[PDB]
């Protein structure tokens, strides 16, 4: 059984999305839909997901850009792992 979240995608561009737009980025299973990514993320870090954007990368993986609600602080979440 394949899991949805593979690991946090951590790069300069990712940090910005995290500090400036309350967004977290993840490497996810390319079979996962935007909705399955939101659900998975909410149940792993207990937060509210507002929007999810996806991209099948040239690394053969899928990258997801998850924006959290104003109640959650991306920086703090990312900092506990």
């Amino acid at each position: 059984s394949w899991d949805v979240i593979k690991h946090p995608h951590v790069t300069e561009k990712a940090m910005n999305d995290m500090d400036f737009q309350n967004k977290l980025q993840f490497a996810v299973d390319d079979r996962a839909s935007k909705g399955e990514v939101a659900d998975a993320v909410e149940e792993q870090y207990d937060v509210t997901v507002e929007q999810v954007n996806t991209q099948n990368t040239m690394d053969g993986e899928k990258k997801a850009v998850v924006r959290l609600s104003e109640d959650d602080d991306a920086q703090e979440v990312a900092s506990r792992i």
């Binding site: 390319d30 040239m58 053969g60």
Partner: protein, 46 residues
């Protein structure tokens, strides 16, 4: 052109394979990626 999801997966794999033999493999074997490819000089499949 327009690539499908599968095509893209295959292209990505080709990009990954197209890398150096790690330095440690050299030491461990005490002394060449024979499949090194160039986008221009070579031609992939499909």
């Amino acid at each position: 052109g327009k690539k499908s999801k599968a095509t893209k997966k295959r292209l990505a794999k080709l990009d990954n394979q197209n890398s150096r033999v790690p330095a440690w493999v050299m030491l461990k074997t005490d002394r060449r990626n024979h499949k090194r490819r160039h986008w221009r000089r070579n031609d992939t499949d499909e």
